[PDB]
RNA sequence: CUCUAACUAUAAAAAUCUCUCUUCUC
């Protein structure tokens, strides 16, 4: 039967969506069922900030923040653990997962 | 009285191709004596061993026999032979075997002479072998020229 | 099974004059002497090695340390 | 200036065989190419942080020899069509570059991101591992 | 080259590995105690112990 | 000195000047040092004893095992391949005469020899089986000081036994020569040999 | 009745399977 009302797409009234490739397995999935992540992280790990800091001209360097958008097929999203299979009435909740860092 | 390796020095050098005889696979790889060399045990790690991942490593070892080898690093302080099996060219293996047949066949006549005259094989090697391997690059071609040209 | 040992007599069971001379020469200059040490010097079978050990301790050539059986401790005179 | 001759690191760290290739400020002239694959055997770890770290130490040594003491480090992932993500080695490579005496300067990311080009390899259902 | 570095463990970061018998720990170098690094040590440990490190720069990762 | 008269006259050398607690009444525990500060506080030269046999509360908890007098630990680890398990008195006599032999050759009051050989024999870089199913391989790791001393002593005693097997030499002598070749950098000792082998494997699988 | 911040990286191969299903009213 209907596992979801939205079919899991989030298309619902758009005719057709262009496909965007999965970042890991190169699956072609519609941009909506193309489970998304904004991986904002430092160009240098938080582990080695000290060594880069002490050996740096331009005191207190900005240390840029690398940006990229990650597109998974849902199969990767299950396996690469970005998403987890949830219980029935827990499929309702769509909010961010309880603010990882606060 | 088997001793006195064919080559110049009393420890093998670095980054060269040799051939060992295999004796044991206990925990990490093969500690193997050398019949290309004197008597010294050298290590190969199972990572430096198998080109293809294998179920039973023994099918690629065949304990007791002779196998291709490469010495990369040599502990020239107390004696250790960093050696591998997979670190040899596909063609140069035959060069290794042919080198070994030359050296072994040279060893046989020197052993015969030593067991006849009861001079230690090292002395007969010292007087005769390496001057030949120096003048002509090998004792086998030295013997080949000696049979025809004295 | 097979003759894998290839071990010779490796020692002497009966002391000759030459080996008597040898042990009497090396009675000094040896810091530690045991039945196994006397075996190490390819001179004695081992059964008579104890005989020799008792033989050396008659004019105080070697003083003993501990007199336990199955292993003896001997150190050269000073 | 403080008599520092600026170099350019231009790190390339794919999922395999990280690259550390110091070049002059002009970028046109090359210095001390040694990569990850040169410093490890197993070929399992062409991109390993340890392979990258020896490669970076060697390039730093050659920079000492030639005389380049300050380096402009450039991180360049595979980018374009293939996964656009940094490799597992370039980070240890830059850590080694900073550690080995060299004075760092102006880290930047130059990985080429296309504007919808070149439908990439794998088919539609993609790598079916 | 004998870079044997003595690093005191100050905080053990649980136990890791598929085996479950190796522990990630925070070792700080005895000289210049302002630098800390996480590395894997195998065998029982507790804080205040001082490990030996042949190298100094292999930062650790969770072992799988 | 200090002659004390008793109806049961304990021997003179056992009554005379023993405010000097000594391992076997011969080898002075004082002025014995550990060169490598890494492994200190895991060898118990701090508490002298009069015999290498004291069965206490040593395994019930996590780290009471590390508080054993190191000579106790060597004795205890010597009774392996124990078809003769138990017979610890045999181990005590064996280690006593090993100490005597160490005192004879290269006098060097034997407790310092024991400590030095134990320090050398422990590997400081080992491996762990990481390769999961696909590419079976080992990966490098450091060794905890407790386990470092543990392996040092295990390799020392096992090398002594291997030297003993089907050999004229008494186990006392094999253990003494193992200690001698381990105190210095002598690669001839089996224990230091396997120490270097494990360290080499770790270096090969960094 | 007042708040907008960081974080990691796994997919070796695993095919097959035969019985026999037997009751509820004070
Ligand atoms: Mg269904
Ligand atoms: Mg969805
Ligand atoms: Mg195809
Ligand atoms: Mg799958
Ligand atoms: Zn995918």
From Swiss-Prot, chain B:
The S1 motif domain is annotated at 15-86
How does this protein assemble?
A: Eukaryotic translation initiation factor 2 eIF2 is a heterotrimeric complex composed of an alpha, a beta and a gamma subunit. The factors eIF-1, eIF-2, eIF-3, TIF5/eIF-5 and methionyl-tRNAi form a multifactor complex (MFC) that may bind to the 40S ribosome. Interacts with CDC123; the interaction is direct. Interacts with GCD1.
| Span covered, complete protein | 3 to 152 of 304
Report what the Swiss-Prot or TrEMBL entry states about this protein's PTMs. Phosphorylated; phosphorylation on Ser-50 by the GCN2 protein kinase occurs in response to low amino acid, carbon, or purine availability. Phosphorylation inhibits the guanine nucleotide exchange factor activity of the eIF2B complex.
- Comment field (misc): Present with 17100 molecules/cell in log phase SD medium.
> Which UniProt keywords are listed?
Cytoplasm, Initiation factor, Phosphoprotein, Protein biosynthesis, RNA-binding
Q: Which GO terms describe its biological process?
A: formation of translation preinitiation complex; translational initiation
- Protein's organism: Saccharomyces cerevisiae (strain ATCC 204508 / S288c) (Baker's yeast)
- The protein's name is Eukaryotic translation initiation factor 2 subunit alpha
According to its UniProt entry, the function of this protein is described as: eIF-2 functions in the early steps of protein synthesis by forming a ternary complex with GTP and initiator tRNA. This complex binds to a 40S ribosomal subunit, followed by mRNA binding to form a 43S pre-initiation complex. Junction of the 60S ribosomal subunit to form the 80S initiation complex is preceded by hydrolysis of the GTP bound to eIF-2 and release of an eIF-2-GDP binary complex. In order for eIF-2 to recycle and catalyze another round of initiation, the GDP bound to eIF-2 must exchange with GTP by way of a reaction catalyzed by eIF2B.
Q: Which family does it belong to?
A: Belongs to the eIF-2-alpha family.
- GO terms of molecular function: ribosome binding; RNA binding; translation initiation factor activity
Q: Which residues carry this modification: Phosphoserine?
A: 50
Record's subcellular location: Cytoplasm, Cytosol
| Predominant localisation class | cytoplasm
Organism classification, top ranks?
Eukaryota, Fungi, Dikarya, Ascomycota, Saccharomycotina
Superkingdom of origin: Eukaryota
Curated annotation (Swiss-Prot), chain D:
> Which PROSITE patterns does the record match to this protein?
RIBOSOMAL_S11 (PS00054)
- Map out region (Disordered) in residue numbers: 108-129
**Which residue stretches does the UniProt record annotate as biased composition, category Basic residues?**
120-129
Is this entry keyworded Signal?
A: no
Fetch the InterPro entries from UniProt: Ribosomal_uS11, Ribosomal_uS11_CS, Ribosomal_uS11_sf
Gene Ontology terms for molecular function: structural constituent of ribosome
Q: Which GO terms describe its cellular component?
A: ribonucleoprotein complex; ribosome
**Gene Ontology biological-process annotations:** translation
Q: Which UniProt keywords apply?
A: Ribonucleoprotein, Ribosomal protein
The UniProt record lists the keyword Hydrolase: no
| Record HAMAP family | Ribosomal_uS11 (MF_01310)
Q: What protein family is recorded?
A: Belongs to the universal ribosomal protein uS11 family.
Recorded protein name is Small ribosomal subunit protein uS11
Gene, per the UniProt record:
RPS14
From Swiss-Prot, chain E:
The record's listing under PANTHER family reads:
40S RIBOSOMAL PROTEIN S28, SMALL RIBOSOMAL SUBUNIT PROTEIN ES28
What taxonomic ancestry is recorded? Answer: Eukaryota, Fungi, Dikarya, Ascomycota, Saccharomycotina
List the GO cellular component terms.
Answer: cytosolic small ribosomal subunit
* Sequence similarity: Belongs to the eukaryotic ribosomal protein eS28 family.
Q: Which InterPro entries match?
A: NA-bd_OB-fold, Ribosomal_eS28, Ribosomal_eS28_CS
Q: Which UniProt keywords are given for this protein, alphabetically ordered?
A: Ribonucleoprotein, Ribosomal protein
| Name of the protein in question | Small ribosomal subunit protein eS28
What is the residue range of the signal peptide feature? none
The encoding gene: RPS28
| GO process annotations (BP) | maturation of SSU-rRNA; ribosomal small subunit assembly; translation
Superkingdom field: Eukaryota
Molecular function (GO) terms listed?
Answer: structural constituent of ribosome
């Amino acid at each position: 039967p209907k596992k979801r009302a939205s079919n899991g797409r989030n298309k619902k009234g758009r005719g057709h969506v262009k496909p965007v490739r999965c970042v890991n397995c190169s699956r072609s999935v519609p941009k909506d069922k193309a489970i998304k992540r904004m991986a904002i992280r430092n160009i240098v790990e938080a582990a080695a900030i000290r060594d880069l800091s002490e050996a740096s001209v331009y005191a207190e360097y900005a240390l840029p923040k690398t940006y990229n958008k990650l597109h998974y097929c849902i199969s990767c999203a299950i396996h690469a653990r970005i998403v987890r299979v949830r219980s029935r009435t827990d499929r309702r909740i769509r909010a961010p997962p309880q603010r990882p860092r606060f | 009285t088997s001793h006195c390796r064919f080559y110049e020095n009393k420890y093998p050098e670095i980054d060269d191709i040799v051939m060992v005889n295999v004796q044991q696979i206990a925990e990490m790889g093969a500690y193997v004596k050398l019949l290309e060399y004197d008597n010294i045990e050298g290590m190969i790690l199972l990572s430096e061993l198998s080109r293809r991942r294998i179920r039973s490593i023994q099918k690629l070892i065949r304990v007791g026999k002779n196998d291709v080898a490469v010495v990369l690093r040599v502990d020239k302080e107390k004696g250790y032979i960093d050696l591998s099996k997979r670190r040899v060219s596909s063609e140069d293996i035959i060069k290794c075997e042919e080198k070994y047949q030359k050296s072994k066949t040279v060893h046989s006549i020197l052993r015969y002479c030593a067991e006849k005259f009861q001079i230690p094989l090292e002395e007969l090697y010292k007087t005769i072998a390496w001057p030949l391997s120096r003048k002509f690059g090998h004792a086998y071609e030295a013997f080949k020229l000696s049979i025809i040209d004295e | 099974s097979k003759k894998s040992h290839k071990d010779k007599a490796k020692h002497a069971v009966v002391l000759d004059q030459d080996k008597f001379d040898r042990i009497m020469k090396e009675a000094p200059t040896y810091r530690y002497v045991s039945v196994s040490v006397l075996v190490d010097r390819f001179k004695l079978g081992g059964s008579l090695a104890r005989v020799a050990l008792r033989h050396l301790e008659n004019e105080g050539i070697i003083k003993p340390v501990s007199k336990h059986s199955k292993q003896a401790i001997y150190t050269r005179a000073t | 200036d403080n008599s520092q001759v600026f170099g350019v690191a231009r790190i390339f760290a794919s999922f395999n065989d990280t690259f550390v290739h110091v070049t002059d400020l002009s970028g046109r002239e090359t210095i001390a190419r040694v990569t990850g694959g040169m410093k490890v055997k197993a070929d399992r770890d062409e991109s390993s942080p340890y392979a990258a770290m020896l490669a970076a130490q060697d390039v730093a040594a050659k920079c000492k020899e030639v005389g380049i003491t300050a380096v402009h480090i450039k991180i360049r992932a595979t980018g374009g069509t293939r996964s656009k993500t940094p490799g597992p080695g370039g980070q240890a490579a830059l850590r080694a570059l900073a550690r080995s005496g060299l004075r760092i300067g102006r880290i930047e990311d130059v990985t080429p991101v296309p504007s919808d080009s070149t439908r990439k390899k794998g088919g539609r259902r993609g790598r079916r591992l | 080259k004998t870079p044997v570095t003595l690093a005191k463990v100050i905080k053990v970061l649980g136990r890791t590995g598929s085996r479950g018998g190796v522990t990630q720990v925070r070792v700080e170098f005895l000289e210049d105690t302002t630098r800390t690094i996480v590395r894997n040590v195998k065998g029982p440990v507790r804080e205040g112990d001082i490990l030996v490190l042949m190298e100094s720069e292999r930062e650790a990762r969770r072992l799988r | 000195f200090v002659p004390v008269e008793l109806a049961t006259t304990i021997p003179v050398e056992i009554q005379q000047a023993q405010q000097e607690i000594k391992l076997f009444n011969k080898w002075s525990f004082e002025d014995v040092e550990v060169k490598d500060a890494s492994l200190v506080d895991y060898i118990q030269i701090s508490k002298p004893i009069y015999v290498a046999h004291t069965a206490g509360r040593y395994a019930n908890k996590r780290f009471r095992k590390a508080q054993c007098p190191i000579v106790e630990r060597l004795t205890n680890s010597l009774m392996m391949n124990g078809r003769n398990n138990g017979k610890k008195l045999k181990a005590v006599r064996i280690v006593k005469h090993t100490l005597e032999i160490i005192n004879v050759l290269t006098d060097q009051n034997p407790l310092q020899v024991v400590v030095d050989a134990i320090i050398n024999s422990g590997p400081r870089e080992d491996t762990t089986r990481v390769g999961g199913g696909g590419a079976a391989r080992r990966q490098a790791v450091d060794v905890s000081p407790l386990r470092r001393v543990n392996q040092s002593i295990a390799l020392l005693t096992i090398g002594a036994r291997e030297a003993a097997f089907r050999n004229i030499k008494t186990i006392a002598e094999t253990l003494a020569e193992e200690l001698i070749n381990a105190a210095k950098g002598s690669s001839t000792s089996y224990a230091i040999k396997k120490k270097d082998e494990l360290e080499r494997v770790a270096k090969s699988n960094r």
